[PDB]
Structures are given as structure tokens and as C-alpha cells.
Design a protein around this ligand. Sequence first.
Ligand SMILES: Nc1ncnc2c1ncn2[C@@H]1O[C@H](COP(=O)(O)OP(=O)(O)O)[C@@H](O)[C@H]1O
Ligand SMILES: Nc1ncnc2c1ncn2[C@@H]1O[C@H](COP(=O)(O)OP(=O)(O)O)[C@@H](O)[C@H]1O
Ligand SMILES: Nc1ccn([C@@H]2O[C@H](CO)[C@@H](O)[C@H]2O)c(=O)n1
Ligand SMILES: Nc1ccn([C@@H]2O[C@H](CO)[C@@H](O)[C@H]2O)c(=O)n1
Lengths: 238, 238
Amino acid sequence: EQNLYDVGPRDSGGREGPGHYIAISGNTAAGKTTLIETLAGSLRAAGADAVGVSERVFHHRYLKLMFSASADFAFPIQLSFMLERHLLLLDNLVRRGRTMVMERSHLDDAMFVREHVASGAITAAQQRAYTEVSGELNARIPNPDLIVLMNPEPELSLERLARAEAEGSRPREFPSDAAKRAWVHRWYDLYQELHDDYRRRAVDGDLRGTELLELDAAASPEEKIATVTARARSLVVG
Amino acid sequence: EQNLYDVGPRDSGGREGPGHYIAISGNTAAGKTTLIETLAGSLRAAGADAVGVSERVFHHRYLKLMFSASADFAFPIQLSFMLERHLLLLDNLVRRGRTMVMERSHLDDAMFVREHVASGAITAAQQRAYTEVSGELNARIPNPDLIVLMNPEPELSLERLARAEAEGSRPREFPSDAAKRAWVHRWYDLYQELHDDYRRRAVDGDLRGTELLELDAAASPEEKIATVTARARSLVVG
Ligand SMILES: Nc1ncnc2c1ncn2[C@@H]1O[C@H](COP(=O)(O)OP(=O)(O)O)[C@@H](O)[C@H]1O
Ligand SMILES: Nc1ncnc2c1ncn2[C@@H]1O[C@H](COP(=O)(O)OP(=O)(O)O)[C@@H](O)[C@H]1O
Ligand SMILES: Nc1ccn([C@@H]2O[C@H](CO)[C@@H](O)[C@H]2O)c(=O)n1
Ligand SMILES: Nc1ccn([C@@H]2O[C@H](CO)[C@@H](O)[C@H]2O)c(=O)n1
């Protein structure tokens, strides 16, 4: 539908350079997928060669082993998230000049490695190797142009996840109810810190030139799309 | 058919530890796929929980961009080969104790990065990052137990490739006839060196305990399977 994996030649008319890059950043079950699908379609309607990319597009077949056998599979599955995200950005955003609406940015993945390092599932030496590769990959990808900061409270995430799992609309990914609850909580705390770092990064760090937009994860989906569209519409190029 | 991506629990009866690991190592169009499919079935007939894995199982959707835009995609596509191979070994061979017959070993991939570094498509800093990750990943995978050294001459590889591409039985992966010819030749030279290194590694290096088996790539398929079976049959465990 969106031609995400085309190895053919660029086709951007006379426009040069990468497309523009919108990232929706926050913990699981915030409403990001819902927002991304609508936003990508709205940008296409405005004339942009835009695509919306949820991580489920590139989830590894071995995903569940990261959560059931983390000291064995957290390191390579985290490498997978990084690498598959990178390749989609390198091709769609950079090579082909398309506009990207993505679940998370390439800057979010390092926080998920930090969680496994803190728990002991990934070693410090493994993290150092990850970071070396991450730095080389990230150097080839432009910063996001708009980061939407939408971090849900843990009990909100878990309420939404429990309903979806119970209705069969999403798979159960964790080895126990407690493992799901605990990862959601540890990720929430790390996301609060990551977003505070992003706020400083955009002023005094390497994200100068990037716009940040705060969004309450408890807002209605229609309020979320209205709020994000009011900033994303400015980024449309034909 | 072979249940390669099962995230469920191990089921090896009373047998502990990894399965056994047979790798077929040599340049493209040697006859490895042909041999691997038959060998895996023969080992299953003998009572082993064996699988045969060709790289085409885990080829990235972006493979062709490694050869048409190498200074942009060689690094992440080489990371993909490494990582997807690693995950299949970590799950099937180690976690689940299955016996593996694989196209190449995890020790072969570094030579493909060396080719891109020599040409300039991968930078020295990119290669250093690759090697750091490669070392951490390889430390979790047992050495191959039997390495079959089967390196075809370049014109033999190219004859077989041209016939398959002409008949539509394999896709054209390269941006030109010359690019195909040149990569095949550079890989051939590097494989001659890699195999000489393996021969020394198995005596004075970290492959002590591993068996090597020489096989002429020009031999008939039935001679190849007879020759490899005569050594692989000894590795069967129930
Ligand atoms: N504002 C909301 N109110 C209630 N449920 C919601 C809301 N947004 C999403 N959900 C539900 O939560 C689950 C996950 O939503 P999703 O958009 O996929 O979140 P995310 O991508 O951030 O992980 C889905 O079942 C979805 O229908
Ligand atoms: N001994 C052989 N003689 C002639 N053609 C062969 C022989 N072995 C393989 N081929 C052909 O060469 C092509 C590639 O063979 P394949 O087994 O897939 O090689 P590899 O896995 O080493 O790359 C196939 O079209 C195959 O039919
Ligand atoms: N680099 C990343 C990105 C995401 N995730 C987690 O993967 C799960 C997908 O349902 C979600 O629980 C999400 O939090 C992850 O573990 N590591
Ligand atoms: N780590 C690796 C392993 C394999 N290859 C090449 O991929 C092609 C697959 O048809 C073959 O040409 C094969 O040589 C590769 O480029 N890099």
C-alpha cells in the first residue's frame, strides 16, 4: 500500500534532499498507531509523498524471546529494532525523499537498551558495542523535524493493553501479567527522563532546529490528530 | 516446514546443550543450497532434529541496494546478514538444541565486510563498529563442528548464475553484468584467503575441535552429498 521496500530509483520530481520527519515518542499504548495512520493519509491528501510507519511493520519474528529470555535475546532483538528502523529511514526518508510519520524516532531506541542494561539482561560490553553501531547509523539519518512527546501513565497503558489482549486485537507479548506490568513501569520512568533530555537537547544540544510538541496521552484521538495536524501541515512539500 | 522461528519452549528429550553445527563455506553458485536441502533431510531420517538454512530464508528486502548503492547500504545490509544469522543460530542451535546445516558459518560474514572496506563502500569506522558487535554476538554461538570448504572458480560461479538468471530461477541482484562479475571475482579471492585462514585456525587457532572437509565445487551433486554425508553421519544425536 505504501511501497515501503522499493529498491527502484528515486522519484521526487525536482525536489532534492530528504523528506521531512515526524516522530511520535512515548510509552506503549499511548495512541501512536491510531494517530500515525490518520496523519500520513492527511499529509498525502495535502500533496506530500508521505508514509506512516508503525514498529509492527518490522517486528522481529523472535520478539517474544526478548521478554521471555531477556539475557539471551534482548541484545540481538534491540539490534533488530535499531537496524530495521534505520533501513526504512535511509531508504524512504533519505534516498527516496519521502516524508515519514514514525512510531518513535531513531533516538528513542537507546532508552530500551538502557532498560535491559539496568536490569542485567544486556551487559555493559554489549551496550558499548550497540552504541558504536548506533552512532555510525544515526550519523546518516537526519534528526526528526517534529517530535510529538506523548508519554502515557502506566495504568493508562496497562488498561488499554489488557482490553486489546482480552479482545484478541493484539497478541500477548510477555511471559506473565507481572512482566508486562513491570516493563511498562520501567519504560515509563525512562521515557519521563528521555523526554526531559529531549527538551534540553532541542535548546542546548544537537536537536536545535527540531520542533517539539507536547501531547497528553489521555486526550481523545480526535483532539490528538487536530493538535498534531496544526503543526504537521506546515511541513508539507510536494 | 522446519519451524525455524518458534518462540516456544525447548523440546529435546533428555539431551542437553546445543545441537551440532555443519557449515558449507564458499563463494556463490558453488552448489551449497542443493547440498544443504538433501543433507538436512538425511539427518532427520537418521533421527536428528536437524534443519537446513539457506541465506535466502533471511535475505533483507533491501538486498539489491547493497549492490546498487553500496556506500549507503553495504554497512546496514551486512549488519542484517550477521544479525539474522545469529538469531537463527541462537534460537535453533543453542536454545532449542537442534542440529543446523547452514549456508556459510557465522565466521564467514566478516569477509564480506572486508570486501566493502577494501572497495571504500564501508568506512574503517563502520567496520570497527561492526566488529565490536560481531565479537559479542559470536561469543554466544558455538564454533561450527564441521566446515565444508567448497570454493568455486569465478567462471564456474558466473556460468551457473547466468543460466539461472536467464531461466528466471533466480533474481538478478546486481546493477550490471560487470558488477556481478566483479563482486564474484573479489569474493573468490577473499574466500581463498579465508579458507587458508580456516585451515590454520583449526590447528593453531580457536577452531581446534572443529573438523574441516575439502570439497571440489565442480563435483557432481551426488558426489558432494556422498562425501559430506560420510562425515556428517557421525554427528547425529537423537
Ligand atoms: N485515546 C484512547 N482511548 C482509549 N483507548 C485507546 C486510545 N488510543 C488508543 N487506544 C487503544 O489502546 C490500544 C493501543 O493503541 P495504539 O494506538 O496502538 O497505541 P501505541 O501505538 O502508542 O502503542 C489500542 O487497542 C487502541 O484502540
Ligand atoms: N554441480 C552443478 N552443476 C551445474 N549446475 C549446478 C551445480 N550445482 C548447482 N548448480 C546450479 O547453480 C545454481 C546455484 O546453485 P546453488 O546450490 O544454489 O549454489 P550456492 O548455494 O552455493 O550459491 C543453481 O541454478 C544450481 O542448479
Ligand atoms: N527499541 C524498542 C522499541 C519497542 N519495544 C517494545 O516492543 C513492544 C512491541 O509490542 C512494545 O512493548 C515496545 O515498548 C521495544 O522493546 N524496544
Ligand atoms: N554476509 C554476506 C553473505 C552473502 N552475501 C551475498 O549475498 C548474495 C545473495 O544472493 C550472494 O551474492 C552472496 O555472496 C553477501 O553479500 N554478504
